[PDB]
Tab-separated table of N, CA, C and O (backbone and C1' of nucleotides) in Angstrom:
chain	number	residue	atom	x	y	z
A	1	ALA	N	-68.015	27.358	-22.564
A	1	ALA	CA	-68.956	26.280	-22.846
A	1	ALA	C	-68.619	25.594	-24.165
A	1	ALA	O	-68.997	24.445	-24.393
A	2	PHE	N	-67.901	26.308	-25.034
A	2	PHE	CA	-67.528	25.762	-26.334
A	2	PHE	C	-66.408	24.735	-26.245
A	2	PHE	O	-66.277	23.911	-27.155
A	3	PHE	N	-65.608	24.757	-25.177
A	3	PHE	CA	-64.518	23.796	-25.040
A	3	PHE	C	-65.057	22.382	-24.853
A	3	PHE	O	-64.616	21.438	-25.518
A	4	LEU	N	-66.019	22.219	-23.942
A	4	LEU	CA	-66.620	20.905	-23.737
A	4	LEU	C	-67.413	20.458	-24.958
A	4	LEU	O	-67.446	19.262	-25.268
A	5	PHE	N	-68.038	21.397	-25.671
A	5	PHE	CA	-68.738	21.048	-26.903
A	5	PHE	C	-67.763	20.534	-27.955
A	5	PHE	O	-68.044	19.555	-28.655
A	6	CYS	N	-66.605	21.187	-28.078
A	6	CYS	CA	-65.578	20.709	-29.000
A	6	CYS	C	-65.059	19.338	-28.583
A	6	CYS	O	-64.826	18.469	-29.431
A	7	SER	N	-64.871	19.128	-27.278
A	7	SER	CA	-64.388	17.835	-26.802
A	7	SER	C	-65.402	16.730	-27.076
A	7	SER	O	-65.026	15.590	-27.370
A	8	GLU	N	-66.694	17.050	-26.985
A	8	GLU	CA	-67.734	16.066	-27.260
A	8	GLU	C	-67.951	15.840	-28.750
A	8	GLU	O	-68.376	14.747	-29.140
A	9	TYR	N	-67.676	16.840	-29.586
A	9	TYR	CA	-67.822	16.701	-31.027
A	9	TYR	C	-66.581	16.131	-31.702
A	9	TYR	O	-66.663	15.724	-32.866
A	10	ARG	N	-65.440	16.110	-31.012
A	10	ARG	CA	-64.243	15.502	-31.587
A	10	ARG	C	-64.436	14.043	-31.992
A	10	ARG	O	-64.007	13.685	-33.103
A	11	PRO	N	-65.044	13.164	-31.183
A	11	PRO	CA	-65.299	11.802	-31.680
A	11	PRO	C	-66.286	11.764	-32.832
A	11	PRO	O	-66.105	10.965	-33.760
A	12	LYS	N	-67.319	12.608	-32.808
A	12	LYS	CA	-68.241	12.673	-33.937
A	12	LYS	C	-67.528	13.146	-35.198
A	12	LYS	O	-67.798	12.648	-36.298
A	13	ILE	N	-66.605	14.099	-35.057
A	13	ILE	CA	-65.846	14.573	-36.210
A	13	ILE	C	-64.928	13.476	-36.733
A	13	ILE	O	-64.791	13.290	-37.948
A	14	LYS	N	-64.286	12.731	-35.829
A	14	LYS	CA	-63.404	11.648	-36.255
A	14	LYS	C	-64.184	10.498	-36.877
A	14	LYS	O	-63.630	9.735	-37.678
A	15	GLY	N	-65.460	10.348	-36.516
A	15	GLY	CA	-66.281	9.324	-37.137
A	15	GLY	C	-66.866	9.742	-38.468
A	15	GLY	O	-67.033	8.905	-39.361
A	16	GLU	N	-67.186	11.028	-38.625
A	16	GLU	CA	-67.734	11.521	-39.882
A	16	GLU	C	-66.659	11.802	-40.924
A	16	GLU	O	-66.952	11.757	-42.124
A	17	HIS	N	-65.432	12.089	-40.500
A	17	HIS	CA	-64.323	12.362	-41.397
A	17	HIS	C	-63.072	11.660	-40.893
A	17	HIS	O	-62.877	11.525	-39.681
A	18	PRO	N	-62.205	11.202	-41.801
A	18	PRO	CA	-61.000	10.481	-41.360
A	18	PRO	C	-60.032	11.338	-40.564
A	18	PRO	O	-59.333	10.803	-39.694
A	19	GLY	N	-59.967	12.641	-40.825
A	19	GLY	CA	-59.084	13.514	-40.078
A	19	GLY	C	-57.692	13.600	-40.670
A	19	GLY	O	-57.007	12.583	-40.814
A	20	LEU	N	-57.261	14.812	-41.015
A	20	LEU	CA	-55.944	15.047	-41.591
A	20	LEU	C	-55.013	15.787	-40.644
A	20	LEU	O	-53.830	15.444	-40.543
A	21	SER	N	-55.517	16.798	-39.944
A	21	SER	CA	-54.711	17.549	-38.993
A	21	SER	C	-55.582	17.925	-37.805
A	21	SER	O	-56.762	18.253	-37.963
A	22	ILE	N	-54.985	17.871	-36.612
A	22	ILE	CA	-55.720	18.206	-35.400
A	22	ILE	C	-56.006	19.698	-35.309
A	22	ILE	O	-57.029	20.094	-34.742
A	23	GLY	N	-55.129	20.539	-35.862
A	23	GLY	CA	-55.360	21.974	-35.802
A	23	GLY	C	-56.571	22.402	-36.612
A	23	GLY	O	-57.423	23.154	-36.129
A	24	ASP	N	-56.662	21.928	-37.857
A	24	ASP	CA	-57.812	22.263	-38.691
A	24	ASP	C	-59.096	21.675	-38.120
A	24	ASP	O	-60.157	22.309	-38.176
A	25	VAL	N	-59.019	20.466	-37.559
A	25	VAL	CA	-60.196	19.847	-36.956
A	25	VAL	C	-60.674	20.668	-35.763
A	25	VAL	O	-61.874	20.919	-35.598
A	26	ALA	N	-59.737	21.100	-34.915
A	26	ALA	CA	-60.101	21.917	-33.762
A	26	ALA	C	-60.666	23.262	-34.197
A	26	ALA	O	-61.616	23.767	-33.589
A	27	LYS	N	-60.098	23.857	-35.250
A	27	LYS	CA	-60.625	25.120	-35.754
A	27	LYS	C	-62.047	24.955	-36.275
A	27	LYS	O	-62.914	25.797	-36.013
A	28	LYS	N	-62.307	23.870	-37.010
A	28	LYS	CA	-63.653	23.628	-37.520
A	28	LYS	C	-64.638	23.382	-36.384
A	28	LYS	O	-65.773	23.873	-36.418
A	29	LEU	N	-64.221	22.626	-35.365
A	29	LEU	CA	-65.101	22.375	-34.228
A	29	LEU	C	-65.399	23.661	-33.464
A	29	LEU	O	-66.537	23.886	-33.039
A	30	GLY	N	-64.391	24.519	-33.288
A	30	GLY	CA	-64.629	25.795	-32.635
A	30	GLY	C	-65.547	26.696	-33.440
A	30	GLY	O	-66.417	27.369	-32.881
A	31	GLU	N	-65.368	26.717	-34.763
A	31	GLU	CA	-66.255	27.503	-35.615
A	31	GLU	C	-67.688	26.994	-35.533
A	31	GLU	O	-68.635	27.788	-35.489
A	32	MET	N	-67.868	25.672	-35.500
A	32	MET	CA	-69.211	25.115	-35.379
A	32	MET	C	-69.828	25.445	-34.024
A	32	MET	O	-71.015	25.786	-33.943
A	33	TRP	N	-69.038	25.352	-32.951
A	33	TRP	CA	-69.551	25.673	-31.623
A	33	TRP	C	-69.877	27.155	-31.487
A	33	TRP	O	-70.770	27.523	-30.716
A	34	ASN	N	-69.168	28.015	-32.220
A	34	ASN	CA	-69.481	29.439	-32.197
A	34	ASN	C	-70.685	29.771	-33.070
A	34	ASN	O	-71.440	30.697	-32.752
A	35	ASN	N	-70.882	29.033	-34.165
A	35	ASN	CA	-72.018	29.287	-35.042
A	35	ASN	C	-73.318	28.734	-34.475
A	35	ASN	O	-74.387	29.304	-34.723
A	36	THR	N	-73.256	27.637	-33.723
A	36	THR	CA	-74.461	27.069	-33.143
A	36	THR	C	-74.937	27.913	-31.962
A	36	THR	O	-74.252	28.827	-31.494
A	37	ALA	N	-76.134	27.594	-31.477
A	37	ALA	CA	-76.710	28.331	-30.364
A	37	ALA	C	-75.998	27.984	-29.059
A	37	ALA	O	-75.357	26.938	-28.924
A	38	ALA	N	-76.119	28.890	-28.085
A	38	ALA	CA	-75.486	28.680	-26.789
A	38	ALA	C	-76.148	27.566	-25.990
A	38	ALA	O	-75.494	26.963	-25.133
A	39	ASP	N	-77.426	27.281	-26.249
A	39	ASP	CA	-78.116	26.220	-25.524
A	39	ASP	C	-77.603	24.835	-25.896
A	39	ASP	O	-77.801	23.888	-25.127
A	40	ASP	N	-76.955	24.693	-27.055
A	40	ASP	CA	-76.429	23.393	-27.456
A	40	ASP	C	-75.279	22.949	-26.561
A	40	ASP	O	-75.037	21.745	-26.417
A	41	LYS	N	-74.564	23.897	-25.955
A	41	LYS	CA	-73.434	23.596	-25.088
A	41	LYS	C	-73.795	23.670	-23.609
A	41	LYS	O	-72.902	23.798	-22.765
A	42	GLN	N	-75.088	23.592	-23.277
A	42	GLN	CA	-75.481	23.649	-21.868
A	42	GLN	C	-75.124	22.371	-21.118
A	42	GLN	O	-74.494	22.467	-20.049
A	43	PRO	N	-75.478	21.167	-21.587
A	43	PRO	CA	-75.033	19.965	-20.861
A	43	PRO	C	-73.529	19.782	-20.887
A	43	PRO	O	-72.957	19.275	-19.915
A	44	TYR	N	-72.867	20.192	-21.971
A	44	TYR	CA	-71.410	20.134	-22.019
A	44	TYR	C	-70.795	21.043	-20.961
A	44	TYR	O	-69.857	20.652	-20.257
A	45	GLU	N	-71.319	22.264	-20.831
A	45	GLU	CA	-70.820	23.178	-19.809
A	45	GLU	C	-71.109	22.652	-18.409
A	45	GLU	O	-70.289	22.810	-17.497
A	46	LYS	N	-72.269	22.018	-18.221
A	46	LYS	CA	-72.586	21.440	-16.918
A	46	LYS	C	-71.623	20.313	-16.567
A	46	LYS	O	-71.149	20.222	-15.428
A	47	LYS	N	-71.318	19.447	-17.537
A	47	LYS	CA	-70.363	18.370	-17.294
A	47	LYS	C	-68.968	18.921	-17.028
A	47	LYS	O	-68.231	18.388	-16.189
A	48	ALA	N	-68.589	19.992	-17.728
A	48	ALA	CA	-67.289	20.610	-17.484
A	48	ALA	C	-67.213	21.194	-16.079
A	48	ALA	O	-66.201	21.038	-15.387
A	49	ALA	N	-68.280	21.864	-15.638
A	49	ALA	CA	-68.304	22.407	-14.284
A	49	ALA	C	-68.274	21.293	-13.244
A	49	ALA	O	-67.623	21.426	-12.201
A	50	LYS	N	-68.964	20.182	-13.514
A	50	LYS	CA	-68.937	19.053	-12.589
A	50	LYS	C	-67.543	18.447	-12.496
A	50	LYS	O	-67.074	18.118	-11.400
A	51	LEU	N	-66.863	18.293	-13.636
A	51	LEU	CA	-65.503	17.762	-13.622
A	51	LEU	C	-64.532	18.720	-12.945
A	51	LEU	O	-63.572	18.276	-12.305
A	52	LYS	N	-64.759	20.030	-13.075
A	52	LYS	CA	-63.897	20.994	-12.401
A	52	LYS	C	-64.124	20.980	-10.895
A	52	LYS	O	-63.170	21.098	-10.116
A	53	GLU	N	-65.380	20.836	-10.464
A	53	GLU	CA	-65.673	20.794	-9.036
A	53	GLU	C	-65.207	19.489	-8.403
A	53	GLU	O	-64.801	19.479	-7.235
A	54	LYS	N	-65.259	18.384	-9.150
A	54	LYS	CA	-64.800	17.109	-8.608
A	54	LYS	C	-63.281	17.076	-8.483
A	54	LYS	O	-62.744	16.544	-7.504
A	55	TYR	N	-62.576	17.638	-9.459
A	55	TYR	CA	-61.118	17.663	-9.435
A	55	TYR	C	-60.605	18.797	-8.554
A	55	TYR	O	-59.981	18.560	-7.520
B	1	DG	P	9.734	-36.748	35.121
B	1	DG	O5'	10.202	-36.861	33.595
B	1	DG	C5'	11.491	-37.378	33.282
B	1	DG	C4'	11.554	-37.842	31.836
B	1	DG	C3'	11.306	-36.752	30.793
B	1	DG	O3'	12.162	-36.946	29.671
B	1	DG	C1'	9.719	-38.472	30.525
B	2	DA	P	12.469	-35.732	28.664
B	2	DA	O5'	12.042	-36.303	27.232
B	2	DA	C5'	12.741	-37.410	26.672
B	2	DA	C4'	11.922	-38.076	25.579
B	2	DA	C3'	11.581	-37.184	24.385
B	2	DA	O3'	11.680	-37.931	23.179
B	2	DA	C1'	9.587	-37.990	25.368
B	3	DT	P	11.518	-37.204	21.754
B	3	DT	O5'	10.079	-37.683	21.245
B	3	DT	C5'	9.807	-39.072	21.103
B	3	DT	C4'	8.373	-39.306	20.660
B	3	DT	C3'	7.902	-38.438	19.490
B	3	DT	O3'	7.169	-39.235	18.569
B	3	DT	C1'	6.413	-38.216	21.298
B	4	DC	P	6.824	-38.682	17.099
B	4	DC	O5'	5.228	-38.745	17.039
B	4	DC	C5'	4.560	-39.979	17.282
B	4	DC	C4'	3.086	-39.753	17.562
B	4	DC	C3'	2.347	-38.933	16.505
B	4	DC	O3'	1.089	-39.527	16.218
B	4	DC	C1'	2.084	-37.928	18.635
B	5	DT	P	0.197	-38.988	14.995
B	5	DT	O5'	-0.960	-38.148	15.712
B	5	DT	C5'	-1.804	-38.778	16.668
B	5	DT	C4'	-2.702	-37.763	17.352
B	5	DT	C3'	-3.458	-36.825	16.403
B	5	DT	O3'	-4.820	-36.716	16.805
B	5	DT	C1'	-2.295	-35.574	18.018
B	6	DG	P	-5.962	-36.402	15.718
B	6	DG	O5'	-6.926	-35.358	16.458
B	6	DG	C5'	-7.713	-35.775	17.570
B	6	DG	C4'	-8.200	-34.582	18.381
B	6	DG	C3'	-9.110	-33.612	17.641
B	6	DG	O3'	-10.055	-33.052	18.544
B	6	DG	C1'	-7.075	-32.520	18.216
B	7	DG	P	-11.256	-32.132	18.001
B	7	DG	O5'	-10.839	-30.657	18.454
B	7	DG	C5'	-10.648	-30.369	19.834
B	7	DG	C4'	-10.039	-28.993	20.024
B	7	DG	C3'	-10.715	-27.867	19.234
B	7	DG	O3'	-10.880	-26.726	20.066
B	7	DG	C1'	-8.406	-27.880	18.795
B	8	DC	P	-11.948	-25.587	19.686
B	8	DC	O5'	-11.106	-24.230	19.779
B	8	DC	C5'	-10.490	-23.861	21.008
B	8	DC	C4'	-9.412	-22.812	20.786
B	8	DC	C3'	-9.860	-21.573	20.010
B	8	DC	O3'	-9.292	-20.409	20.593
B	8	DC	C1'	-8.020	-22.567	18.922
B	9	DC	P	-10.045	-18.994	20.482
B	9	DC	O5'	-8.951	-18.033	19.824
B	9	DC	C5'	-8.396	-18.361	18.559
B	9	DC	C4'	-6.956	-17.895	18.459
B	9	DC	C3'	-6.741	-16.693	17.560
B	9	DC	O3'	-5.540	-16.030	17.920
B	9	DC	C1'	-5.873	-18.637	16.514
B	10	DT	P	-5.261	-14.535	17.405
B	10	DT	O5'	-4.629	-14.738	15.952
B	10	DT	C5'	-3.379	-15.404	15.809
B	10	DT	C4'	-2.907	-15.370	14.366
B	10	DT	C3'	-3.440	-14.202	13.534
B	10	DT	O3'	-2.418	-13.734	12.666
B	10	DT	C1'	-3.986	-16.217	12.481
B	11	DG	P	-2.318	-12.176	12.290
B	11	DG	O5'	-1.669	-12.181	10.828
B	11	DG	C5'	-0.427	-12.842	10.602
B	11	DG	C4'	-0.392	-13.481	9.221
B	11	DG	C3'	-0.709	-12.538	8.064
B	11	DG	O3'	0.093	-12.864	6.935
B	11	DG	C1'	-2.278	-14.303	8.093
B	12	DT	P	0.322	-11.784	5.768
B	12	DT	O5'	-1.084	-11.743	5.003
B	12	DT	C5'	-1.148	-11.985	3.603
B	12	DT	C4'	-1.166	-13.476	3.311
B	12	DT	C3'	-1.720	-13.853	1.944
B	12	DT	O3'	-1.122	-15.064	1.500
B	12	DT	C1'	-3.128	-14.726	3.604
B	13	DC	P	-0.891	-15.324	-0.068
B	13	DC	O5'	-2.333	-15.762	-0.605
B	13	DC	C5'	-2.963	-16.934	-0.090
B	13	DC	C4'	-4.197	-17.287	-0.905
B	13	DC	C3'	-4.311	-16.566	-2.240
B	13	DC	O3'	-4.964	-17.398	-3.186
B	13	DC	C1'	-6.118	-15.935	-0.858
B	14	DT	P	-4.245	-17.754	-4.577
B	14	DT	O5'	-5.428	-18.327	-5.486
B	14	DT	C5'	-6.549	-17.508	-5.792
B	14	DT	C4'	-7.817	-18.077	-5.182
B	14	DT	C3'	-9.074	-17.869	-6.016
B	14	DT	O3'	-9.982	-18.938	-5.794
B	14	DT	C1'	-9.318	-16.733	-3.979
B	15	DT	P	-10.665	-19.690	-7.038
B	15	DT	O5'	-12.200	-19.248	-6.957
B	15	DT	C5'	-12.551	-17.878	-7.087
B	15	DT	C4'	-13.630	-17.502	-6.090
B	15	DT	C3'	-14.860	-16.838	-6.700
B	15	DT	O3'	-16.021	-17.192	-5.962
B	15	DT	C1'	-13.844	-15.345	-5.200
B	16	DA	P	-16.863	-18.499	-6.363
B	16	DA	O5'	-18.360	-18.145	-5.921
B	16	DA	C5'	-19.185	-17.357	-6.771
B	16	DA	C4'	-19.750	-16.164	-6.022
B	16	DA	C3'	-20.851	-15.411	-6.757
B	16	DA	O3'	-21.713	-14.789	-5.814
B	16	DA	C1'	-19.011	-13.992	-6.498
B	17	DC	P	-23.149	-14.219	-6.262
B	17	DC	O5'	-23.495	-13.156	-5.122
B	17	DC	C5'	-22.448	-12.620	-4.320
B	17	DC	C4'	-22.402	-11.107	-4.428
B	17	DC	C3'	-23.486	-10.486	-5.311
B	17	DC	O3'	-23.952	-9.282	-4.717
B	17	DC	C1'	-21.379	-9.803	-6.066
B	18	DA	P	-25.334	-8.610	-5.187
B	18	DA	O5'	-25.019	-7.044	-5.139
B	18	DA	C5'	-24.389	-6.483	-3.993
B	18	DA	C4'	-23.491	-5.321	-4.378
B	18	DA	C3'	-24.180	-4.203	-5.157
B	18	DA	O3'	-23.684	-2.940	-4.736
B	18	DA	C1'	-22.398	-5.080	-6.439
B	19	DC	P	-24.692	-1.706	-4.529
B	19	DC	O5'	-24.170	-0.603	-5.564
B	19	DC	C5'	-24.051	-0.923	-6.943
B	19	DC	C4'	-22.644	-0.648	-7.440
B	19	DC	C3'	-22.547	0.418	-8.531
B	19	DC	O3'	-21.384	1.213	-8.338
B	19	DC	C1'	-21.653	-1.611	-9.330
B	20	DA	P	-21.311	2.697	-8.948
B	20	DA	O5'	-20.742	2.482	-10.428
B	20	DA	C5'	-19.569	1.699	-10.633
B	20	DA	C4'	-18.772	2.207	-11.824
B	20	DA	C3'	-19.384	3.386	-12.556
B	20	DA	O3'	-18.368	4.117	-13.231
B	20	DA	C1'	-19.617	1.388	-13.853
B	21	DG	P	-18.712	5.510	-13.954
B	21	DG	O5'	-18.727	5.140	-15.510
B	21	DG	C5'	-17.539	4.671	-16.132
B	21	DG	C4'	-17.809	4.210	-17.554
B	21	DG	C3'	-18.628	5.177	-18.411
B	21	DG	O3'	-18.046	5.271	-19.702
B	21	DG	C1'	-19.647	3.047	-18.410
B	22	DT	P	-18.572	6.360	-20.759
B	22	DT	O5'	-19.350	5.484	-21.844
B	22	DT	C5'	-18.697	4.386	-22.473
B	22	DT	C4'	-19.542	3.845	-23.610
B	22	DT	C3'	-20.437	4.884	-24.280
B	22	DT	O3'	-20.440	4.702	-25.688
B	22	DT	C1'	-21.759	3.103	-23.463
B	23	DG	P	-20.544	5.978	-26.659
B	23	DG	O5'	-21.581	5.522	-27.786
B	23	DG	C5'	-21.220	4.506	-28.710
B	23	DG	C4'	-22.436	3.698	-29.123
B	23	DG	C3'	-23.505	4.481	-29.884
B	23	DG	O3'	-24.021	3.690	-30.945
B	23	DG	C1'	-24.447	3.529	-27.928
B	24	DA	P	-25.014	4.337	-32.030
B	24	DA	O5'	-26.432	3.685	-31.679
B	24	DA	C5'	-26.581	2.272	-31.695
B	24	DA	C4'	-27.878	1.855	-31.028
B	24	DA	C3'	-29.137	2.518	-31.590
B	24	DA	O3'	-30.124	1.532	-31.856
B	24	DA	C1'	-29.051	2.772	-29.234
B	25	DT	P	-31.464	1.915	-32.655
B	25	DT	O5'	-32.605	1.825	-31.539
B	25	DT	C5'	-32.774	0.622	-30.802
B	25	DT	C4'	-33.687	0.837	-29.610
B	25	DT	C3'	-35.037	1.485	-29.933
B	25	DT	O3'	-36.092	0.613	-29.548
B	25	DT	C1'	-34.010	2.508	-28.038
B	26	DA	P	-37.624	1.032	-29.786
B	26	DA	O5'	-38.060	1.671	-28.388
B	26	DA	C5'	-37.825	0.955	-27.182
B	26	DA	C4'	-38.349	1.725	-25.983
B	26	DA	C3'	-39.734	2.342	-26.169
B	26	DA	O3'	-40.503	2.167	-24.989
B	26	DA	C1'	-38.185	4.024	-25.584
B	27	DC	P	-42.031	1.680	-25.087
B	27	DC	O5'	-42.826	2.750	-24.208
B	27	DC	C5'	-42.457	4.119	-24.265
B	27	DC	C4'	-42.050	4.624	-22.894
B	27	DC	C3'	-43.016	5.620	-22.278
B	27	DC	O3'	-42.900	5.610	-20.861
B	27	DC	C1'	-41.009	6.726	-22.861
B	28	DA	P	-44.022	6.323	-19.958
B	28	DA	O5'	-43.607	7.869	-19.971
B	28	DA	C5'	-42.413	8.290	-19.321
B	28	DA	C4'	-42.222	9.793	-19.452
B	28	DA	C3'	-43.515	10.616	-19.463
B	28	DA	O3'	-43.364	11.768	-18.644
B	28	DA	C1'	-42.215	11.151	-21.341
B	29	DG	P	-44.616	12.353	-17.827
B	29	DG	O5'	-44.204	13.868	-17.522
B	29	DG	C5'	-44.651	14.914	-18.379
B	29	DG	C4'	-43.492	15.792	-18.814
B	29	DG	C3'	-43.888	17.202	-19.247
B	29	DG	O3'	-42.874	18.133	-18.887
B	29	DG	C1'	-42.882	16.084	-21.061
B	30	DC	P	-43.228	19.695	-18.743
B	30	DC	O5'	-43.146	20.254	-20.242
B	30	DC	C5'	-43.758	21.498	-20.571
B	30	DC	C4'	-43.167	22.077	-21.846
B	30	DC	C3'	-44.060	23.084	-22.565
B	30	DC	O3'	-43.265	24.057	-23.235
B	30	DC	C1'	-43.705	21.234	-23.966
B	31	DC	P	-43.895	25.482	-23.631
B	31	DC	O5'	-44.395	25.286	-25.142
B	31	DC	C5'	-45.341	26.197	-25.704
B	31	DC	C4'	-45.283	26.186	-27.223
B	31	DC	C3'	-46.538	26.701	-27.914
B	31	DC	O3'	-46.211	27.203	-29.207
B	31	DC	C1'	-46.304	24.412	-28.369
B	32	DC	P	-47.208	28.213	-29.960
B	32	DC	O5'	-47.484	27.512	-31.376
B	32	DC	C5'	-47.974	26.171	-31.436
B	32	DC	C4'	-49.041	26.032	-32.510
B	32	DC	C3'	-50.300	26.835	-32.259
B	32	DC	O3'	-50.966	27.080	-33.490
B	32	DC	C1'	-50.774	24.530	-31.974
B	33	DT	P	-51.330	28.584	-33.922
B	33	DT	O5'	-52.901	28.527	-34.220
B	33	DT	C5'	-53.378	27.909	-35.411
B	33	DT	C4'	-54.691	27.192	-35.155
B	33	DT	C3'	-55.810	28.076	-34.589
B	33	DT	O3'	-57.025	27.883	-35.318
B	33	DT	C1'	-55.503	26.159	-33.232
B	34	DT	P	-58.102	29.075	-35.426
B	34	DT	O5'	-59.103	28.823	-34.198
B	34	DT	C5'	-59.824	29.922	-33.628
B	34	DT	C4'	-61.234	29.512	-33.223
B	34	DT	C3'	-61.960	30.505	-32.341
B	34	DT	O3'	-63.357	30.226	-32.374
B	34	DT	C1'	-61.259	28.654	-31.044
B	35	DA	P	-64.425	31.283	-31.803
B	35	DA	O5'	-65.329	30.407	-30.816
B	35	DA	C5'	-64.737	29.362	-30.048
B	35	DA	C4'	-64.876	29.641	-28.564
B	35	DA	C3'	-64.844	31.125	-28.188
B	35	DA	O3'	-65.897	31.421	-27.281
B	35	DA	C1'	-63.252	29.933	-26.918
B	36	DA	P	-67.075	32.424	-27.715
B	36	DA	O5'	-68.244	32.118	-26.670
B	36	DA	C5'	-68.714	30.788	-26.500
B	36	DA	C4'	-68.495	30.322	-25.074
B	36	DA	C3'	-68.882	31.343	-23.998
B	36	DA	O3'	-69.630	30.710	-22.966
B	36	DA	C1'	-66.662	30.620	-23.665
B	37	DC	P	-70.855	31.485	-22.270
B	37	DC	O5'	-70.507	31.442	-20.709
B	37	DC	C5'	-69.233	31.881	-20.250
B	37	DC	C4'	-68.382	30.701	-19.819
B	37	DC	C3'	-68.074	30.639	-18.321
B	37	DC	O3'	-68.203	29.302	-17.853
B	37	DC	C1'	-66.065	30.603	-19.554
B	38	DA	P	-68.414	29.010	-16.286
B	38	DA	O5'	-66.925	28.961	-15.700
B	38	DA	C5'	-66.477	29.969	-14.801
B	38	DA	C4'	-65.128	29.601	-14.211
B	38	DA	C3'	-64.522	30.650	-13.293
B	38	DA	O3'	-64.968	30.444	-11.958
B	38	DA	C1'	-62.916	29.980	-14.901
B	39	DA	P	-64.671	31.548	-10.828
B	39	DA	O5'	-63.127	31.327	-10.475
B	39	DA	C5'	-62.326	32.428	-10.079
B	39	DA	C4'	-60.851	32.078	-10.152
B	39	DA	C3'	-59.909	33.239	-9.870
B	39	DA	O3'	-59.584	33.294	-8.461
B	39	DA	C1'	-59.384	32.311	-11.975
B	40	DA	P	-58.432	32.377	-7.804
B	40	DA	O5'	-57.081	33.168	-8.126
B	40	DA	C5'	-56.917	34.501	-7.656
B	40	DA	C4'	-55.564	35.056	-8.055
B	40	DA	C3'	-55.409	36.562	-7.865
B	40	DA	O3'	-54.873	36.860	-6.554
B	40	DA	C1'	-54.958	36.024	-10.108
B	41	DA	P	-53.299	36.751	-6.219
B	41	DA	O5'	-52.663	38.067	-6.866
B	41	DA	C5'	-53.200	39.349	-6.559
B	41	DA	C4'	-52.694	40.386	-7.545
B	41	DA	C3'	-53.228	41.795	-7.336
B	41	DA	O3'	-52.380	42.530	-6.423
B	41	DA	C1'	-53.540	41.154	-9.599
B	42	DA	P	-50.933	43.095	-6.860
B	42	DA	O5'	-51.251	44.447	-7.652
B	42	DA	C5'	-50.270	45.002	-8.524
B	42	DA	C4'	-50.772	46.284	-9.164
B	42	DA	C3'	-51.022	47.438	-8.189
B	42	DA	O3'	-50.468	48.641	-8.702
B	42	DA	C1'	-52.955	47.040	-9.490
B	43	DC	P	-50.509	49.988	-7.826
B	43	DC	O5'	-51.851	50.718	-8.306
B	43	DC	C5'	-52.003	51.091	-9.670
B	43	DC	C4'	-53.350	51.752	-9.908
B	43	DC	C3'	-53.734	52.836	-8.895
B	43	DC	O3'	-54.207	53.987	-9.583
B	43	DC	C1'	-55.474	51.255	-9.093
B	44	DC	P	-54.473	55.358	-8.788
B	44	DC	O5'	-56.068	55.442	-8.701
B	44	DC	C5'	-56.846	55.413	-9.893
B	44	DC	C4'	-58.330	55.403	-9.570
B	44	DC	C3'	-58.760	56.403	-8.493
B	44	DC	O3'	-59.935	57.092	-8.903
B	44	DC	C1'	-59.488	54.229	-7.917
B	45	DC	P	-60.218	58.586	-8.383
B	45	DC	O5'	-61.707	58.517	-7.803
B	45	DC	C5'	-62.796	58.255	-8.678
B	45	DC	C4'	-63.940	57.586	-7.938
B	45	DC	C3'	-64.616	58.445	-6.867
B	45	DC	O3'	-66.026	58.260	-6.924
B	45	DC	C1'	-63.863	56.430	-5.907
B	46	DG	P	-67.014	59.232	-6.108
B	46	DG	O5'	-67.745	58.251	-5.077
B	46	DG	C5'	-68.513	57.156	-5.565
B	46	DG	C4'	-68.780	56.144	-4.465
B	46	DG	C3'	-69.460	56.709	-3.214
B	46	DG	O3'	-70.531	55.862	-2.817
B	46	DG	C1'	-67.495	55.542	-2.616
DNA sequence: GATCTGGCCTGTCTTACACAGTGATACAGCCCTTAACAAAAACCCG
């Protein structure tokens, strides 16, 4: 569920910060998705499951 | 009857056209870092 949350927060991260490296940005997004509650990634996980079922 | 001529073959003879090869440029595929979920299998006891 954290993968779709990271994918959805990547544009927010690029808007809040200019971005220096994709690796550090991805690490920070993963750390944030792990520190936040699991309910925050529920619609993201639902959209990921929908995209997996459609493809 | 002998001579000149239009038409059907025939062996070349130039050609345009399809490729051929090359250094440099441009797309176009493989790892990277979290990660919570998504699957494939081998083996074992019920």
